[PDB]
Structures are given as structure tokens and as C-alpha cells.
Amino acid sequence: SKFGAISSVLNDILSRLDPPEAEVQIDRLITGRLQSLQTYVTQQLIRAAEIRASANLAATKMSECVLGQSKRVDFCGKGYHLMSFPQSAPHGVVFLHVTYVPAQEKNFTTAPAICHDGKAHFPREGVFVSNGTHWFVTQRNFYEPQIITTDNTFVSGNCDVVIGIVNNTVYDPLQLE
Amino acid sequence: LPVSMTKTSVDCTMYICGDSTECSNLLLQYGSFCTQLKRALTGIAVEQDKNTQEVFAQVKQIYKTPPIKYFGGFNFSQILPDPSKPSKRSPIEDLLFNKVTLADAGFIKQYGDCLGDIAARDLICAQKFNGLTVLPPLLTDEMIAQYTSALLAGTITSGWTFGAGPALQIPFPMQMAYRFNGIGVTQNVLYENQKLIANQFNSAIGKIQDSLFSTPSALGKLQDVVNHNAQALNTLVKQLSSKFGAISSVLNDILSRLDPPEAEVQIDRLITGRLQSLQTYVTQQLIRAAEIRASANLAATKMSECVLGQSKRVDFCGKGYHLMSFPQSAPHGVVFLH
Amino acid sequence: LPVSMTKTSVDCTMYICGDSTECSNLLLQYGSFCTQLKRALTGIAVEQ
Amino acid sequence: SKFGAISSVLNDILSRLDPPEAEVQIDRLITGRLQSLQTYVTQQLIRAA
Amino acid sequence: VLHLTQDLFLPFFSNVTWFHAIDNPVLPFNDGVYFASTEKSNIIRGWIFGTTLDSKTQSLLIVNNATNVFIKVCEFQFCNDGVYSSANNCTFEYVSQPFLMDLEGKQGNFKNLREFVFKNIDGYFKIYSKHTPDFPQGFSALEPLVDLPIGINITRFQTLLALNRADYYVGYLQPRTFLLKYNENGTITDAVDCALDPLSETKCTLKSFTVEKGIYQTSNFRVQPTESIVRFPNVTNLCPFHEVFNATRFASVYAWNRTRISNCVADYSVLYNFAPFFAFKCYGVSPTKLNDLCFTNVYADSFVIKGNEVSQIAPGQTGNIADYNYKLPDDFTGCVIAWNSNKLDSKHSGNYDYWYRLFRKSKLKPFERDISTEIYQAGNKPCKGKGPNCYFPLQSYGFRPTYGVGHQPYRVVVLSFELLHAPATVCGPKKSTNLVKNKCVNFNFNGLTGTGVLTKSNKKFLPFQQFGRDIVDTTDAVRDPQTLEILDITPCSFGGVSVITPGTNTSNQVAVLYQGVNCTEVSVAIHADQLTPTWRVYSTGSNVFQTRAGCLIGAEYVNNSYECDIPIGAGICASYQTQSQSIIAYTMSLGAENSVAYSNNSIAIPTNFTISVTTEI
């Protein structure tokens, strides 16, 4: 680009004008070519910062998901995280997140606490679920129907302050033996 | 949290040489100098659209609130959409949209009333006079509210299961009992003080509205964005009337009073000066765009973790032990209710 | 970990024109190429 | 640094040359000293982030 | 490579005027002429050029025969049919290989098309020819033939004929950006014009031949003004310049007579007539295009002065006169005039009337008069008189009819103009048009040249007001200099064109969006042919849509909802969807609508599970 001068070739512009008049010319060509380089450097700095941010994120993701199990949601993939594997790519890295996703679900029935005899019983972990006729206990993320027992429930309450309460009987493996 | 800023499409030749063929020809001598500027501005606009998408479009299926609103005694009417309002926005959304003033809406097609301004034409018309525009966002302020409502209705009827797999419904008292159990205190305490917890929830939700109403400016973070984006464009146009070393700031007068070579020397002084002032604005916009994208990445992470689940990391989702979080849309930003 | 840096408060008029009225007047012809600089420095200081 | 002018000090430039002739050289020095400052400000802005 | 050139070329799909031969009209010449001819063996000889085709302006001949050409730059007179009858000032002959190559495969069916294109950029006439054995649509390159420095004002283009016992295809080239596909061997295989279609302009910008699906922002449109209205001051008073330039007693430099020029129309042709220019150097204003200006006040100082002091007087000079008699401002917006006057300041026996200063206590500030008689002090004596150590300030400007060139009584008069933001009282002679409203028209209000849509305004313009602006200091309302009414000034029309297209591997249709402007404005102007874009997309009536993000032409509106494909703006997306295929505009669908079944005592808990492996880069 001429940048507003006689020519863009230095050996050409010199021989066709006297030195200082051609210098008035060479100084314009210089003050240009310098702006181009300055713009290049600034843009490279901005892209370098944007790349460094992603590199930091990739290092964190490697340490967290690859070297352990993470509880943060949607961090290491969609679903409940299990594990991940790294793969190298040109100028980058590729993660293979393994996640656990639930499946076919069925509406049953539910209740806050079961009142056997004036006392509210609560599941130690999981939910109270009813087939429709009988009451049971189970986990959260998988349905496995377990007979109601004194070891799967803990007692604290008075059967008069919880709303939605229902009636049924809770069994114990201690009175039988 | 800010999420995005205004999109701008500044134009080289119109800004620098108003419909002057000689000035355009002399600009052409600098090579591909402002094609870089146009590419940078296009990148900025695409980045803003991607930011808003990442923050808000976290759910593939939009849900709907149950027709009745009795979630175990908890009062929620301040956050779910109000059917009576034409815009279908919650009262908290309405206060937020009324407490922020935008200098340039963009989606106005103002062109056509500038002649009918009667009074002195405003800043928008002035910027339209010399080749600078503002593009409208792809996602309107109305469907952002729809996304927020879907996120809100997913939380209070299905827990956090809708954020991982299929949406499984569960009563709100039991969901709150599980959230209680997650922080290390048993569920029986909630099943004892259900009335107290509901009353405290309602009181806090009520008083947050008064706190936002009466405060002078609690939305300063969102307002600074529009303030800076306007006070940059103003100084870009106020610099169209600086001599830069020539004899006048009027290109027509320069080229209606002088002939070939002298017109040349003065037009060149003005081209160099107005090509700088233009190149300085793009770098500032690039740095500001990087800042806003970092702020949007933070907002996306906070939404995903606090809203679609319960977080254990301290002081991330608000001061204290975390239970819930509710999103609300704001102009060029998002607002969390921890 | 670094937390903050040094706050500078440069000024264009004294920097480019050592107490010279003529150089100040010539600088005045370039428009607002000084207010932006001062605003940037002030923002950096408040940010620190 | 002369920046293409005749002297790097703005004291003899206005003792060697009458205002208009000095202005020619004074404008050279001023554009140059207005850049250095712009570069400083831009690098500081980038380093702050 | 896909090297894109901005060069003089014939337009694509352009209109070639086909002729026939069984009388050889003259064709105008402007920015090159394309030529084509399909003939059996030969019916066309060559081409003549020049201006007026007479023995007064230089011409050219490319007349050909069996074995060579006859390139010559001559000034022939006429032939009216041995194709010329004058060779007086005729040199620069040239001989090379003949322009026509004819080959037949034992049959005349190989009718070769002989293309020719010429141009005279900075002289240097170039010729290009190629022979390919209504009009074929296959690409054929045009190998350059000869390139020699003609350097004549070529204005008229003609052609010859032959003798004997369906051709003449003439095109006209204009500067158009082209993009040419260079084959790996170095030939050219495909070319696209960048002023033909939206799709051609898109591929031209990205300099490629395949355009991926998406929306590309390419150029900007503007409504070109219909008319040009000029409003210059009601009066048409010629300035008293005549009185200034031909007085008989022009005051000398010491007391520079300053006259006032105001409330007049400034025509300087009379200035040209009343000036045997010998030194008309100008700095603040140029003298050629000077009558297109509206000056507020004009200052007309005249002083007779020597020949070298004519060079002395200039903005910011030095000397016995430039520093002690008449110093011009450094930022002088105005010019000086000097012509020799040896008939009015000269007489026999001498003439010592004039005076000049070489003795002043300090420098004379610009535009100041120091008429005074005070003897300069030398040393420390308070002496008041003439002689040694007591010098009289003024000296005689002695003039006689016999001097040298640098010592003649040169008559100098200066003009000072104030071309600033102020109500001008002195303008140039023009015809003031009428006023057209609600229509983009070039305006020339008292020298404030610009383009904009005018209208009536309900402003409260004070009696002393003339203009109005914003905090951005751009002129907004300019008081009609005649109808004393307030007139808003809009930027006519300025926007941006974006082209929505599916991949060219799929289809070639396009749709055009005019950014930030409503289509009622552009539908009027496209019908009146005033748009800067020449590419003209179809408008059936079913394909117009007012989006909040602009206004879209060429796509239909379908109310259905889909996942976004090509984001346009303001919640509108367009896509290529089967009807059998076309381009439609629809609204975004946020997601598959779903509703949950919340109840007081209902829970759904999963019975099974799946294992999914995702990826992240």
C-alpha cells in the first residue's frame, strides 16, 4: 500500500527524487508500516488473553473431573457425573465425560411421615413410596422396594404437627427375635 | 450480573468522508485498514448474542406452572408471571424494567421521526446522521421472560431432577425437607416448623421488593454499561468537528473552495485524524466485550449450580447456607434471589 | 497470588507540552484525546 | 527522541524558529508524544484485566 | 487464486448493441469499448480513433490486411469510403503480427468469434484479442495483444468494412470490481461480476465461489437525491470589486487601504478580466472553483509594492515590509493578487509619491496599520530629526517607467474571507431553486452544502438565530434564507444490506434485508430507481415483511415455529424449507412445550438408568 506517496517500493522511490524530498516520502511510508505492526501486536495480545482464560478452565476441568468425582452440576457433562477421560488434539484437549442418566419413571404416591403409634417415622435416606395399597421405602435415583423396618426409619415427633401424614404400621427385626 | 451490551455496526466511509468520492478514493490508499474494524464489530455482536443464549437457554423444554398456586403455604406470587400484565412479567421484573433507562433502544426504526422531532434532534438521531447504528438483540425482552418462567416453574414442582434428566414431580414440603437435610440438619425440624418457615419466606420475599423500590440505585452495575456505551459513542461523533491541522472541519467547504493538490493536502490531514479516532473506539470496545463475556460466564455458572441444584461451596450462592435461588430477568442482565 | 498493582495518574498536557502555552494550544486542536486517557487511568485506580 | 524534527527539546525550537516555522516542527513533536502516551494507556488497560 | 480486481471491464449480462451489414455510424468512446464479430472468413478490417475524425486532432488507425497490422497515430482528414487523405503530423507508426487468426477444419462451420477490448488509461492504449472456433455463454479469456503509449484524447470510436462480390457486437466498459478464477496452469476459468446480484456481491466480498448457509453483511445502501436544490441570498448584487481593482491612487503598504466588501454576490470572472495575472498565488482559497462559496465578510486591502515583495507578502513571512508594513496572519483564509502596473505609477522626470516603512520599534502584528511619523531612536539619544543617529522612519518608493522586473510598480490587492459558521452575506452567482419537502435532495443553504430530507419545523427560532445543532455539534436546523422557516436536516437514507442465502451447493436463491429502515420508504425509492444498490431483488407482493430489525424483501412469512436456522433479528429466523423449495420467515420456537403434573402427594421415581458419554473441546 502506498500510504499516500509516490510509490511503495523503496529502491524505486529513492531513484526518482532527491534524498530529503524522497525522505519526506520515506518518512511517510515508515510512519505507516509501523501502525500496521502496532495493530497486529495489540490484537495478538487480546487473543492471547482470551486463550489463556480457556487454558485455565481446561486445567481446572482436568483436575476436577478427571482426577476425581465432581458434585458440581452441568460442569462435567449433562447428568450425574461418573468419570471422564482425556484425549489430546492439535492446540487443545478433548474430554469424554461419562454420566449417569435416569430412565423410565412411574408415579406412585408419597407421604411425609408414617405414624405408627403417636410417633412420626422418617426414612433415613430416600422417600416413602406407596405402590397404591402398601407402604415401602426406597432410594431417590433408583426404585428398589424395601420392606419398612426400624433400621430404615428414625423416630422423632408426636403425630400431630406434620401435614399430609398417613397411617400404616412399621415393623422391627428386634421384637421378632 | 451484566450479561451483554449493545451491538454496534459503525461504518468506515460514511463516518470518515460524507458522500465524497475524492475522500473515499484517498481512503482506499490505506489498504484493508477498516475491514479489520468491521470484522471486529461483527465478532462483538455475535459474542453478545452467544452470551445471552448461554446464560438463559439452559432448558430444552419449557414448563408451565400448575393452574392452582398452593405449594404447602409458601407464597410465590411475586416471582411467577402475572397474566394481567400484557408483557407477562412478574412484579419484580416490572420494577427492574422500570428502574433502568436505556439511552438507545435500537428496536425503534427511529428513522422517519427525526424530521418530525420539532425540538432539537436527540442523540439517537445525531448518531444516525453520521453513519453509526445500533442493532437489536436476537432474543427479545419478552422471550427471555418466557425462559425465566420455564426455569422458575421447573424448580418449584420437580426439585433439581429437571436439571439432570427427566422432570420428576415431588411436593414442595418434601423438596424443602431434602434441601434441609443437605445442609446437615434433619428433616423433622422442617416438619415441625413448616408454618414458621413459610412465614419467614413470605416476609423476606415481601421486604426485598421494598428494598429494591426505595434504594436510590441498587442497579448501578447494569446502568454503568449503558452509561459507558453512550459516553463512548458521544465522543466518537463530537470529534467530527475538529480541524486536526486543516483549515476547516467541513469537507465540502474544503472541496468547494480549493482545487486539486491543495484539496489533497488538507483532505489527507483530515483522513489520518478521523481514521485514528475510529481505531481507538474499537480497542476499547474489544476490552469491554472481554469484560462482559467474563461476567456472563460467571452468570451462566451461577445459574447452573445454584438454580439447578444445591451448592456446597461457601459464599458462592449467597451469604449463609444455601437452599434455593430464583432467577429474574433485567435489562442486559440477570438477577438472582438466593 | 497478585491482588493489585500501582495506581498512576499521568497527565497529557504536562507530559507532551512542558509548560508551553503554544504546545497546549496545538494539543487543544486534537479534540478529546486527553479526557479519555484521564478517565482510563481513573478507572484503573478505582478498580485496584 | 526527535521524531523527525530538528531538536528534541521544546525550548530552542521556539528560540530558533518563529511561531509558524516552529509550529511545523512543534506539530511533529506533538503527534509523536501523543502516541507514546496512547501506547502506555493501552498496555496498562490490558494489564489491569 | 481468486484474485479480485477493481478495473475497467464490460458488465456481465450487459446489453450489447448488435448491428448488421449489407452506414457504419460513429460510436461514442468512453472508458473503453468491447468489440465482437462472428464472420465466415473476413468482413471487418480495422478501427479508426481520435476526436472529430478530422485534420485538427490526432487520430489512430488499426487497419489490418492479410499479413500484419498498420498501427499509426496520425491526423488524417477524411476518406468517405486508401482509408485516409492526410499525413502531415503523422508519426509513431507500428507493425506487428496481424490481429486476425482464422482456422477451419475443412469446413466453414467453425465460425470463430473474435473478441476485442481496448482502454486508454493514462494513455498507454492496450489491445486484447482471442478467437474461439445469438451469443455463446461459455467463458473465453482475452490474451493481451499490444500495449503502446498512445496518449491522445480518444472520444470517438469507429470501424471499417471489407469488399465482397451477423457481427459488430459493441460493448462499453465501466470501472467494475471483478473476481477471476485462475486455473492452476495460469489461465482463467470463471468470473463473477460484483454489481449483478446479491449472491454475486456476497461471493465477491469473501472472494470465493461457494457460499455456506448463513446471513452475510455486505454493503450499505443510500437513497440518491432526486434533484439538487440551492438556496442562495435573495439579492443578486454584484460586488463593488470593480471599484476596488481600478482606482487610481492605491494606498501604499505603510497605510494599507482596507476596504469593505459586504452584501453582494461574488462573481470573480470580472476579477479575471481586470487582471493581467503576473502573480496570483493563493493560500486560503483557490481561484478556480471560487464562485461556489458563501463568505460572511470580505476585506479588500490594496497596496502597490515591488516585484520581490510580491513574493514577500504571504501568510507568515519576513522582511522589511512583511514585518514592519503589512504582516498577514499565519492562519490566513484568503489570497493576494498582483499584476504589473507601469502605466499609472510611472511618468517622465520621476515620481516619488509612494512610501514604505523599514523603521518600526517592534514587529507589526497581523492585520494592523502603524501610520505614524516618529524618528527611530538609535543608541540612547532622544533626538527628533533627520540625519545621522536620527533616522526618518519612512522612505520613498521611487517609481519611473524604467526599472527591472523585480523593481517595477506591481499593483497588489488582497482579499480576506471569513468562511466560518456565520450567516454569510457574500455568495457566488447561482440560480436559487425552489424547495422540495419530504424528499431527499442535495441542499446548498448559504454555502452549507449537504444532502438531507427537508420538512416543516415547529421550532421557536429566535430573530438572531441561523443554525441549530446537538451536543454533537452537527447542523440540524437551518433557517430558510428566503422563507424564514425552520428546516430540519436528516441524513436522507443510510443503512446496510444483508443477504440471507442457503448454501450455493443447495440452491441459489437469495433474500435481501435493508437494515434499520422501514420498507415503505425503500419500496417507494426502488420503484423510482434512486437506490445506491444496483442489484434489484424481486418483490412479488407476497414477499415483504416488516421486521423489528429492519425490513425484509424476497421471503414469505409462515406463522409456524421451528428451531432457528438463519438468525435475522428481533426473534425472527429464516430457513430453506420444502414446499418445491423456497425461503420463508418464521418466529423462533424456544422449545417443545411440556407441562408437569405437580400434586400434593405424587412422586415419580426412576426404575431404570442409561449410561451416556458426551464430549467437550
Ligand SMILES: *[C@@H]1O[C@H](CO)[C@@H](O[C@@H]2O[C@H](CO)[C@@H](O)[C@H](O)[C@@H]2O)[C@H](O)[C@H]1NC(C)=O
Ligand atoms: C403393592 O406392592 C406389593 C409389593 O410387595 C405388590 O404385591 C405383590 O403381589 C403379588 C401377588 O399379586 C405377591 O405375590 C407379591 O409378594 C407382592 O406382595 C402389589 O402389586 C402392589 N400393589 C399395587 C397396586 O401396585
Ligand SMILES: *[C@@H]1O[C@H](CO)[C@@H](O[C@@H]2O[C@H](CO)[C@@H](O)[C@H](O)[C@@H]2O)[C@H](O)[C@H]1NC(C)=O
Ligand atoms: C391415624 O389413626 C389414628 C388412630 O390410631 C387417628 O387418630 C384418631 O383421630 C381421631 C380424630 O381424627 C380421634 O377421634 C381418635 O381418638 C384418634 O386419636 C388419626 O386421625 C389417623 N390419621 C389419619 C391421617 O388417618
Ligand SMILES: *[C@@H]1O[C@H](CO)[C@@H](O[C@@H]2O[C@H](CO)[C@@H](O)[C@H](O)[C@@H]2O)[C@H](O)[C@H]1NC(C)=O
Ligand atoms: C401472596 O402474596 C401476595 C403479595 O404480593 C398477596 O397479594 C396481596 O393481596 C392483597 C389483597 O389480597 C393486596 O392488598 C396486596 O397488595 C398484595 O397484592 C397474596 O394475597 C398472597 N397469597 C397467598 C395465597 O398467600
Ligand SMILES: *[C@@H]1O[C@H](CO)[C@@H](O[C@@H]2O[C@H](CO)[C@@H](O)[C@H](O)[C@@H]2O)[C@H](O)[C@H]1NC(C)=O
Ligand atoms: C480606500 O480607497 C477607496 C477609494 O478611494 C475608498 O473607497 C471609496 O472611497 C470613496 C471616496 O470618494 C467613497 O465615496 C466610496 O464610498 C468608497 O468608500 C476607501 O474608503 C479607502 N479605504 C481606506 C481604509 O483608506
Ligand SMILES: *[C@@H]1O[C@H](CO)[C@@H](O[C@@H]2O[C@H](CO)[C@@H](O)[C@H](O)[C@@H]2O)[C@H](O)[C@H]1NC(C)=O
Ligand atoms: C433398562 O434399559 C436398558 C436399555 O436402556 C434395557 O436393556 C435393554 O434390554 C433389551 C432386552 O431386555 C435389549 O434388547 C436392549 O438392547 C437393551 O440392552 C434394560 O432391559 C432395562 N431394564 C429394565 C428393568 O427396564
Ligand SMILES: *[C@@H]1O[C@H](CO)[C@@H](O)[C@H](O)[C@H]1NC(C)=O
Ligand atoms: C403420573 O400421573 C399424572 C396424572 O396425569 C401424569 O400427568 C404424570 O405424567 C404421571 N407420571 C408418570 C407416568 O411418570
Ligand SMILES: *[C@@H]1O[C@H](CO)[C@@H](O)[C@H](O)[C@H]1NC(C)=O
Ligand atoms: C437490456 O437488456 C435486458 C434484457 O435483454 C433488459 O434490461 C432491457 O430489455 C435492455 N435495456 C435497454 C434496451 O435499455
Ligand SMILES: *[C@@H]1O[C@H](CO)[C@@H](O)[C@H](O)[C@H]1NC(C)=O
Ligand atoms: C500489409 O501491409 C503491410 C504494410 O504496408 C505490408 O508490409 C504487408 O506486406 C501487407 N500484407 C499483405 C499485402 O498481405
Ligand SMILES: *[C@@H]1O[C@H](CO)[C@@H](O)[C@H](O)[C@H]1NC(C)=O
Ligand atoms: C503534432 O501534434 C502533437 C500533438 O500535440 C504536437 O505536440 C506537435 O507539436 C505537432 N507537430 C507539429 C505541430 O509540427
Ligand SMILES: *[C@@H]1O[C@H](CO)[C@@H](O)[C@H](O)[C@H]1NC(C)=O
Ligand atoms: C489529452 O491527452 C493529453 C496527453 O497526456 C493529456 O495531457 C490531456 O489532459 C488530455 N485531455 C484532457 C482534456 O484531459
Ligand SMILES: *[C@@H]1O[C@H](CO)[C@@H](O)[C@H](O)[C@H]1NC(C)=O
Ligand atoms: C476601470 O474601469 C473601466 C471602465 O470602462 C475599464 O475600462 C478599465 O479597464 C478599468 N481599469 C482597469 C485598470 O482595469
Ligand SMILES: *[C@@H]1O[C@H](CO)[C@@H](O)[C@H](O)[C@H]1NC(C)=O
Ligand atoms: C426572498 O424571496 C422569496 C421569493 O421571492 C420570498 O418569498 C421571501 O419572502 C424573501 N425573503 C426575504 C427575507 O425577503
Ligand SMILES: *[C@@H]1O[C@H](CO)[C@@H](O)[C@H](O)[C@H]1NC(C)=O
Ligand atoms: C415505518 O413504519 C411506519 C410506516 O412508514 C411508520 O411507523 C414509520 O414510518 C416507520 N416506523 C417507525 C416506528 O418510525
Ligand SMILES: *[C@@H]1O[C@H](CO)[C@@H](O)[C@H](O)[C@H]1NC(C)=O
Ligand atoms: C398464521 O399467520 C398469520 C399471519 O401470517 C397470523 O395472523 C395467524 O394468526 C397465524 N395462524 C396461526 C395458527 O399461527
Ligand SMILES: *[C@@H]1O[C@H](CO)[C@@H](O)[C@H](O)[C@H]1NC(C)=O
Ligand atoms: C392440596 O391440598 C390443599 C389443601 O388441602 C388444597 O387446597 C389443594 O387443592 C390440594 N391440591 C391438590 C392437587 O390436590
